[PDB]
Design a protein. Structure first.
Length: 64
């Protein structure tokens, strides 16, 4: 059995949860260096490192 996870306080502090696919990496703290924001789950598994997505698809993602 398995239907739970324990993410860090950074990827999930207390500013509202989020679920678009499965799991998402970066796109909050970093959002600058290689591979700005990426999201892996289902029917998606994609990552954007371009400023376009790092500025348009990074802020509204969850960070402020």
């Amino acid at each position: 059995l398995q239907d739970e996870v324990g993410a860090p306080p950074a990827l999930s502090a207390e500013e509202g949860v989020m679920e678009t696919r499965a799991e998402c990496r970066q796109g909050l703290l970093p959002c600058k260096d290689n591979k700005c924001y990426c999201c892996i789950g289902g029917g998606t598994r994609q990552c954007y490192a371009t400023l376009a997505e790092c500025r348009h698809a990074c802020l509204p993602l969850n960070t402020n």
